[PDB]
């Protein structure tokens, strides 16, 4: 008891400092950044806010409860106040409440007091200049609080932050005018709590009412604030719309646009994983392997944790349907390994041309196939076994009888033996010629050609268009 009682005081001071000065220096600094320059945007505290939010998402967040200085909620949410020279007095009032909190119990517990608190900014009337400061002062307690998952009486409080964000959405439909240099930070912050829309709604069932609401927000941002807005909202669309049918494959067709410019960073890569599974549902394997590889290869630096391992998991699925895959056991991480353990023997069965080896993988690992969600291609891969199996033996064997190859091709009668190779040439597999009497399959090859034209002529536009973009970057980054 004395140890646990005296170890309570040490923890709070760290949130009492960094959690106090995180939105004070970044948010209060963004106030001066939003007064001037305006360049145009930047607003580097918006990306610094991303660093602080992602910092809280690990440790320590805020609430929950923690029983440490719950008076931080009324601190920033009250006392604009009101015009800038009067706000300076309230900038001293934060220090006044620092002394009040340094004297008495400092209101270490709020809970049901969030009802007057969250409505106090509406009692001030008003900030009135910066809506992102009002939305952030209310959300910063509540957004990390969603990670508690208590599911009692505070879920509707998260919904109240969603209503405050809807007031942020109506103001996202009006002012402008003109260059709402704060709406990019509103795109950032709202995309977060739009994913908190996803989490809080997923506590019970699908959000479908918010699918029409997301389409209302996604379409009302057109065309003005779509920049960096439409990208995050399209992932908010694509993610759960990939979980719930339907039509998103043809919906993103008419939705594009592209939509440029890609922001922010890994956002477009993960979008190419989301739409990567989409474009993989059309089964064209050149665009699917390029969108899946570009999804993972374009994503630094992690941690955390396993979904960046999931894009790598589903990445080589289209490579399994290509007919040739390397053994990936050397790419296993300490985490991704234990997650894909069935998928290991799966791609090992894809390398081999044995049917029973692949079918036993299906019967045993079908439970993990339910966990991943990819099924339909597991039964049709038997056609990849007959095409890779015939690619194997044909190129392999000098002249193979249709009765001897019939074991690995499982039928290979005297009739279909013609089509196996012939319709493989239709798919561009093997050139083997067969004169059918008994018969026997005599595989030869003569090709000397290509390896030339498209690679070098494309490399011209590749390199040139690249260095042109690198011009568009460097030439435009010299403002300082």
């Amino acid at each position: 008891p004395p140890g646990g009682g005296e170890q309570e005081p040490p923890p709070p001071p760290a949130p009492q400092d960094v959690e106090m000065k995180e939105e004070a220096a970044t948010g209060g600094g963004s106030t001066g950044e939003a007064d001037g320059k305006t360049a145009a945007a930047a607003a580097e505290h918006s990306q610094r806010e991303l660093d602080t939010v992602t910092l809280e998402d690990i440790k320590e967040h805020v609430k929950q409860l923690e029983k440490a200085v719950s008076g931080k909620e009324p601190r920033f949410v009250l006392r604009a106040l009101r015009m800038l020279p009067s706000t300076s007095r309230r900038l001293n009032h934060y220090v006044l409440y620092k002394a009040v909190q340094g004297f008495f119990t400092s209101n270490n517990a709020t809970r049901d007091f969030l009802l007057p608190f969250l409505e106090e900014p509406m009692d001030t009337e008003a900030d009135l200049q910066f809506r992102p400061r009002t939305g952030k002062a209310a959300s910063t307690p509540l957004l990390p609080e969603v990670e508690a998952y208590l599911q009692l009486l505070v879920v509707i409080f998260m919904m109240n932050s969603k209503r405050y964000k809807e007031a942020q959405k109506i103001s996202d439909d009006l002012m402008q005018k003109i260059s709402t240099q704060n709406r990019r930070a509103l795109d950032l912050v709202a995309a977060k709590c739009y994913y908190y829309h996803a989490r809080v709604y997923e506590f019970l069932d699908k959000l479908d009412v918010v699918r029409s609401f997301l389409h209302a927000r996604l379409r009302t941002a057109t065309l003005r604030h779509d920049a960096d807005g439409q990208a995050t909202l399209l992932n908010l669309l694509l993610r759960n719309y990939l979980h719930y049918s339907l039509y998103d494959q043809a919906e993103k067709l008419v939705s594009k646009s592209v939509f440029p410019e890609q922001a922010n960073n890994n956002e477009w890569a993960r979008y190419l994983y989301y739409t990567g599974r989409i474009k993989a549902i059309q089964l064209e394997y050149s665009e699917a392997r390029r969108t899946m590889t570009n999804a993972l290869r374009k994503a630094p630096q992690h941690t955390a944790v396993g979904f960046k391992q999931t894009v790598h998991k589903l990445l080589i699925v289209v490579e399994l349907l290509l007919g040739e895959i390397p053994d990936r056991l050397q790419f296993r991480q300490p985490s991704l390994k234990r997650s894909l353990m069935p998928y290991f023997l799966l791609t090992q069965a894809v390398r081999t041309g044995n049917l029973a080896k692949f079918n036993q993988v299906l019967d045993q690992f079908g439970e993990k196939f339910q966990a991943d969600g990819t099924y339909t291609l597991i039964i049709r891969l038997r056609h990849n076994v007959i095409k890779t199996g015939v690619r194997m033996i044909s190129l392999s064997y000098s002249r193979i009888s249709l009765a001897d190859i019939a074991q690995k091709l499982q039928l290979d009668s005297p009739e279909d033996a013609e089509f196996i190779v012939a319709k493989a040439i239709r798919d561009g597999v093997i050139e083997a010629s067969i004169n059918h009497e008994k018969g026997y399959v005599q595989s030869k090859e003569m090709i000397d050609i290509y390896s030339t034209r498209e690679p070098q002529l494309a490399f011209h536009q590749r390199i040139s268009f690249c260095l042109d973009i690198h011009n568009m970057s460097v030439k435009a980054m010299r403002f300082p």
Binding site: V53, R270, T303, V305, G306, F307
Partner: peptide, 24 residues
């Protein structure tokens, strides 16, 4: 990041090759 997506979730052979001789 931690932002965005990720926080959501013939043998060798020894014996058989030596046996091929004495098989036939």
């Amino acid at each position: 990041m931690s932002e965005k997506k990720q926080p959501v979730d013939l043998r060798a052979e020894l014996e058989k090759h030596g046996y091929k001789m004495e098989t036939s």
